């Protein structure tokens, strides 16, 4: 079944888009410092208001300013997120009846005594790409 593969690829693309936007939420300067340098390279690119830069806000709320090391860390961390994002996208482009229902469901009767909870599909992917995933609670921002 390719349909599960196409869903699991689109979900992993959705989490990475939900991952890096959490960073741009907690640090607007990640996108802001970037779009300053692209504007002198690709002059077509529209950058937001000057007030949104200096007050370090996106819609209403001003965040706390970060030092250069934590910003550039996340700029290379979102970089390997985007490489994961494009790698999955490439394979996803390269992959994308009643009796066959019951034939698999009888094969789903195999191994009934599997006494084990399984919540590790949507959770191990979300925790892999979220902030502060390496320490016990909060020591290092870097994701798993």
């Amino acid at each position: 079944n390719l349909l599960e593969t196409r869903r699991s690829l689109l979900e992993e693309m959705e989490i990475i888009e939900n991952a890096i936007a959490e960073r741009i939420q907690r640090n607007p300067e990640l996108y802001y410092h970037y779009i300053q340098e692209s504007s002198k390279v690709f002059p077509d690119t529209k950058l937001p208001r000057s007030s949104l830069i200096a007050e370090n806000k996106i819609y209403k709320f001003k965040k706390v300013k970060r030092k250069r090391k934590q910003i550039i860390l996340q700029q290379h961390e979102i970089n390997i997120f985007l490489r994961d994002y494009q790698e999955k996208q490439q394979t996803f482009n390269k992959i994308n009846f009643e009796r066959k229902l019951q034939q698999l469901e009888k094969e789903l009767k195999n191994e009934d005594e599997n006494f084990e909870l399984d919540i590790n599909s949507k959770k191990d992917k979300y925790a892999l790409f979220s902030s502060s995933s390496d320490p016990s609670r909060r020591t290092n921002i870097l994701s798993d």
Binding site: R26, K57, F61, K62, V64
Partner: peptide, 25 residues
């Protein structure tokens, strides 16, 4: 992470022996 701005019987109980801490296991 998220601190954003916008834009009376005192001597009696010692005599009677109250408030002396004691426990039953």
């Amino acid at each position: 992470e998220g601190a954003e701005q916008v834009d009376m019987p005192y001597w009696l109980y010692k005599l009677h022996g109250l408030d002396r801490e004691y426990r039953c296991e």
